[PDB]
Amino acid sequence: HGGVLAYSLAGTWYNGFVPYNTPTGQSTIQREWDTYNPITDPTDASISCNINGASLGSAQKSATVAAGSSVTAYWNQWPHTIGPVMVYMANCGGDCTTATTSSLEWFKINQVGLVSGTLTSGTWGMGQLVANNNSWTTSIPSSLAAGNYILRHELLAIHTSNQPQFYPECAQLIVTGGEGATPPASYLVKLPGAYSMSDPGVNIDIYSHETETNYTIPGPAVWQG
Numbered sequence: 001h002g003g004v005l006a007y008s009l010a011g012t013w014y015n016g017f018v019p020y021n022t023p024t025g026q027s028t029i030q031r032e033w034d035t036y037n038p039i040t041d042p043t044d045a046s047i048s049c050n051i052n053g054a055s056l057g058s059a060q061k062s063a064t065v066a067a068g069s070s071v072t073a074y075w076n077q078w079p080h081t082i083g084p085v086m087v088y089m090a091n092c093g094g095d096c097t098t099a100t101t102s103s104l105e106w107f108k109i110n111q112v113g114l115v116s117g118t119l120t121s122g123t124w125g126m127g128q129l130v131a132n133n134n135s136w137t138t139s140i141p142s143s144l145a146a147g148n149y150i151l152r153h154e155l156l157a158i159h160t161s162n163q164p165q166f167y168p169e170c171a172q173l174i175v176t177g178g179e180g181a182t183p184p185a186s187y188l189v190k191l192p193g194a195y196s197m198s199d200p201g202v203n204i205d206i207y208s209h210e211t212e213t214n215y216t217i218p219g220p221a222v223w224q225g
């Protein structure tokens, strides 16, 4: 329970949205997310940028960063330790502030699932996130084409048998520089669309598979540039 409260993007601090408070008056690079609760339906309409995922209009900011830049997301004191961490991006195809995030083409730039051990006693990316000051650091691909992008962080907590808990947040970026590269169509997915309850990593009971050492992370392959 929680989410991304703030960012450090290419050396600069950015405040995130404050959940449970009204969006009126708030100003952030982050899309509006209203509660600490997970999205439990993998096909939920708002799974791209959480509920309500709304733009802040004139108060909506965007972080300008070079392709190749390091981007860090900071969480609350995150209480869950079992499941993957995933970082996605999507071209807004225009202004991000006016973009419907559920219509975008999402590609994955970083993930860490089961690093070693078994589902129930192993090391997960989410455990690594907690251990690293409740934060996750990865780079925007060096080659990425300049443009307007959403940067999306997602935690999939799978500690409750057969109930996935998706915790997504979105931040608006202006990506500068780069080398004009775009991910091929095979890396691109929709949100919702990418996930379902037939995915082995989504509809999972870890407690009936306590010697299992494989975990196929849901969603597409990672596009590193």
Ligand SMILES: *[C@@H]1O[C@H](CO)[C@@H](O)[C@H](O)[C@H]1NC(C)=O
Pocket (backbone or CB within 6 Å): 074, 075, 133, 135
């Ligand atoms: C730990 O994260 C907090 C934000 O939650 C940040 O203010 C602080 O600088 C971080 N500390 C270190 C040592 O990275």
Ligand SMILES: *[C@@H]1O[C@H](CO)[C@@H](O)[C@H](O)[C@H]1NC(C)=O
Pocket (backbone or CB within 6 Å): 200, 201, 204, 214, 215, 216, 217
């Ligand atoms: C682990 O491996 C088996 C095949 O050996 C596969 O059927 C199963 O879905 C995998 N589980 C996950 C969570 O990826």
Ligand SMILES: [Cu+2]
Pocket (backbone or CB within 6 Å): 001, 002, 079, 080
């Ligand atoms: Cu929780």
Ligand code: NA
Pocket (backbone or CB within 6 Å): 061, 062, 095, 096, 097, 172
């Ligand atoms: Na904008």
